[PDB]
PDB file of C-alpha atoms in Angstrom:
ATOM      1  CA  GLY A1302       0.425   0.102   0.273  1.00 41.59           C
ATOM      2  CA  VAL A1303       3.189   2.600   0.208  1.00 43.06           C
ATOM      3  CA  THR A1304       3.997   3.848  -3.387  1.00 44.51           C
ATOM      4  CA  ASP A1305       6.060   7.236  -2.341  1.00 47.48           C
ATOM      5  CA  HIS A1306       9.801   6.060  -2.385  1.00 48.80           C
ATOM      6  CA  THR A1307      11.232   7.717   0.063  1.00 50.16           C
ATOM      7  CA  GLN A1308       8.419   6.402   2.572  1.00 46.16           C
ATOM      8  CA  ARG A1309       9.871   3.048   0.189  1.00 46.00           C
ATOM      9  CA  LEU A1310      13.383   3.256   1.158  1.00 44.91           C
ATOM     10  CA  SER A1311      12.837   4.344   5.304  1.00 47.79           C
ATOM     11  CA  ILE A1312      10.164   0.717   5.413  1.00 46.16           C
ATOM     12  CA  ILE A1313      12.879  -0.624   4.050  1.00 44.89           C
ATOM     13  CA  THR A1314      15.735   0.618   6.380  1.00 43.25           C
ATOM     14  CA  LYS A1315      13.708   0.310   9.688  1.00 46.70           C
ATOM     15  CA  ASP A1316      13.872  -3.626   8.571  1.00 46.55           C
ATOM     16  CA  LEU A1317      16.156  -4.460   7.252  1.00 45.78           C
ATOM     17  CA  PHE A1318      17.521  -3.920  11.059  1.00 47.70           C
ATOM     18  CA  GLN A1319      14.646  -5.032  12.644  1.00 50.29           C
ATOM     19  CA  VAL A1320      14.628  -8.154  10.637  1.00 49.01           C
ATOM     20  CA  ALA A1321      18.527  -8.665  11.077  1.00 46.79           C
ATOM     21  CA  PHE A1322      18.796  -8.796  14.322  1.00 47.64           C
ATOM     22  CA  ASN A1323      15.535 -10.655  15.292  1.00 49.71           C
ATOM     23  CA  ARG A1324      17.135 -13.719  12.653  1.00 51.56           C
ATOM     24  CA  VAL A1325      20.337 -13.201  14.261  1.00 51.30           C
ATOM     25  CA  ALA A1326      19.517 -13.022  17.591  1.00 48.03           C
ATOM     26  CA  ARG A1327      16.984 -16.459  17.709  1.00 45.19           C
ATOM     27  CA  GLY A1328      20.154 -17.955  17.122  1.00 42.10           C
ATOM     28  CA  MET A1329      22.120 -16.059  20.042  1.00 42.54           C
ATOM     29  CA  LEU A1330      22.929 -16.433  24.024  1.00 43.43           C
ATOM     30  CA  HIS A1331      20.615 -14.043  25.701  1.00 43.79           C
ATOM     31  CA  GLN A1332      24.162 -12.362  26.891  1.00 44.82           C
ATOM     32  CA  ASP A1333      25.248 -11.151  23.408  1.00 41.49           C
ATOM     33  CA  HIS A1334      21.724 -10.282  22.376  1.00 38.31           C
ATOM     34  CA  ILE A1335      22.619  -6.294  23.911  1.00 40.51           C
ATOM     35  CA  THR A1336      25.615  -6.691  21.827  1.00 38.07           C
ATOM     36  CA  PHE A1337      24.814  -7.191  18.538  1.00 36.99           C
ATOM     37  CA  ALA A1338      21.902  -4.665  19.235  1.00 35.97           C
ATOM     38  CA  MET A1339      24.670  -2.145  20.597  1.00 36.80           C
ATOM     39  CA  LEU A1340      26.393  -2.847  16.817  1.00 40.68           C
ATOM     40  CA  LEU A1341      23.652  -2.374  15.227  1.00 40.27           C
ATOM     41  CA  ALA A1342      22.360   0.619  16.865  1.00 41.53           C
ATOM     42  CA  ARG A1343      26.171   2.454  15.442  1.00 41.61           C
ATOM     43  CA  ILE A1344      26.177   1.204  12.153  1.00 42.49           C
ATOM     44  CA  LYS A1345      22.836   3.025  11.958  1.00 41.66           C
ATOM     45  CA  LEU A1346      24.031   6.265  13.958  1.00 41.52           C
ATOM     46  CA  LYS A1347      26.877   5.986  11.336  1.00 42.11           C
ATOM     47  CA  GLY A1348      24.235   5.551   8.461  1.00 42.62           C
ATOM     48  CA  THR A1349      21.461   8.008  10.148  1.00 39.74           C
ATOM     49  CA  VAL A1350      21.691  11.436   8.499  1.00 39.60           C
ATOM     50  CA  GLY A1351      22.080  14.685  10.413  1.00 39.28           C
ATOM     51  CA  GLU A1352      23.937  13.511  13.590  1.00 37.48           C
ATOM     52  CA  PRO A1353      28.002  12.956  14.265  1.00 38.64           C
ATOM     53  CA  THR A1354      29.537   9.923  13.839  1.00 40.49           C
ATOM     54  CA  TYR A1355      30.379  10.469  18.264  1.00 41.60           C
ATOM     55  CA  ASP A1356      33.566   8.810  17.672  1.00 41.13           C
ATOM     56  CA  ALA A1357      35.459  10.211  20.215  1.00 41.99           C
ATOM     57  CA  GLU A1358      32.653   9.632  22.548  1.00 40.92           C
ATOM     58  CA  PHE A1359      32.441   5.950  21.706  1.00 39.79           C
ATOM     59  CA  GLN A1360      36.543   5.327  21.613  1.00 39.04           C
ATOM     60  CA  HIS A1361      36.581   6.653  25.105  1.00 41.61           C
ATOM     61  CA  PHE A1362      33.254   4.230  26.376  1.00 43.51           C
ATOM     62  CA  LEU A1363      35.426   1.267  24.887  1.00 43.75           C
ATOM     63  CA  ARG A1364      38.743   2.210  26.368  1.00 40.40           C
ATOM     64  CA  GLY A1365      38.444   4.722  28.102  1.00 40.24           C
ATOM     65  CA  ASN A1366      40.343   2.697  31.046  1.00 40.71           C
ATOM     66  CA  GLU A1367      43.490   2.800  28.672  1.00 44.59           C
ATOM     67  CA  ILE A1368      43.963   5.980  28.887  1.00 44.75           C
ATOM     68  CA  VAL A1369      46.187   6.016  31.695  1.00 46.94           C
ATOM     69  CA  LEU A1370      46.725   7.537  35.182  1.00 44.04           C
ATOM     70  CA  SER A1371      49.773   8.852  37.126  1.00 40.41           C
ATOM     71  CA  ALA A1372      49.923   6.906  40.592  1.00 44.79           C
ATOM     72  CA  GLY A1373      48.892   9.521  42.546  1.00 46.56           C
ATOM     73  CA  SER A1374      47.121  12.269  40.087  1.00 49.50           C
ATOM     74  CA  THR A1375      43.810  10.787  41.524  1.00 48.76           C
ATOM     75  CA  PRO A1376      42.004  12.980  43.654  1.00 45.57           C
ATOM     76  CA  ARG A1377      39.464  12.213  46.750  1.00 45.71           C
ATOM     77  CA  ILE A1378      36.045  13.316  45.891  1.00 45.23           C
ATOM     78  CA  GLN A1379      33.015  13.219  48.480  1.00 43.83           C
ATOM     79  CA  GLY A1380      31.090  10.409  48.362  1.00 45.74           C
ATOM     80  CA  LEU A1381      32.623   8.782  45.218  1.00 43.17           C
ATOM     81  CA  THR A1382      34.891   5.507  46.019  1.00 46.37           C
ATOM     82  CA  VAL A1383      38.019   4.865  45.013  1.00 47.17           C
ATOM     83  CA  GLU A1384      36.822   3.496  41.446  1.00 49.30           C
ATOM     84  CA  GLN A1385      34.435   5.971  41.001  1.00 49.83           C
ATOM     85  CA  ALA A1386      37.333   8.395  41.212  1.00 46.65           C
ATOM     86  CA  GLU A1387      39.317   6.982  38.784  1.00 43.22           C
ATOM     87  CA  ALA A1388      36.394   6.746  36.466  1.00 40.88           C
ATOM     88  CA  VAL A1389      35.246  10.365  36.669  1.00 37.34           C
ATOM     89  CA  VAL A1390      39.032  11.373  36.176  1.00 40.84           C
ATOM     90  CA  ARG A1391      39.319   8.970  33.104  1.00 39.74           C
ATOM     91  CA  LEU A1392      36.144  10.449  31.963  1.00 38.44           C
ATOM     92  CA  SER A1393      37.006  14.235  32.706  1.00 35.27           C
ATOM     93  CA  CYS A1394      39.627  13.655  29.548  1.00 34.94           C
ATOM     94  CA  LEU A1395      36.931  14.227  26.920  1.00 35.83           C
ATOM     95  CA  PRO A1396      36.083  18.091  25.949  1.00 35.27           C
ATOM     96  CA  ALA A1397      32.412  17.941  27.125  1.00 37.31           C
ATOM     97  CA  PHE A1398      32.885  16.552  30.704  1.00 35.58           C
ATOM     98  CA  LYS A1399      36.274  18.748  31.483  1.00 32.36           C
ATOM     99  CA  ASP A1400      33.771  20.059  34.144  1.00 27.18           C
ATOM    100  CA  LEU A1401      32.512  17.277  35.692  1.00 24.66           C
TER     101      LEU A1401
END
């Protein structure tokens, strides 16, 4: 019942993502469903129009721990444990979270 080509293209893209996830995740363990969904979400974010790639934020998401904290460089923050302090210090490297 859809004749306009733009609507058909949008429906095809959405159904592609949906059917791919359904068909794959029906043969996956429940732990890995979220992983593949995250991968497809990142693929769409690469393919979506008007949104930046967010390459730096995802790079910190996947390799934030790879950032180095010098010994004694972690301060003490009221209410945060040591681990949360290291996490916040690592997250402060990005420019958006500079005042975190």
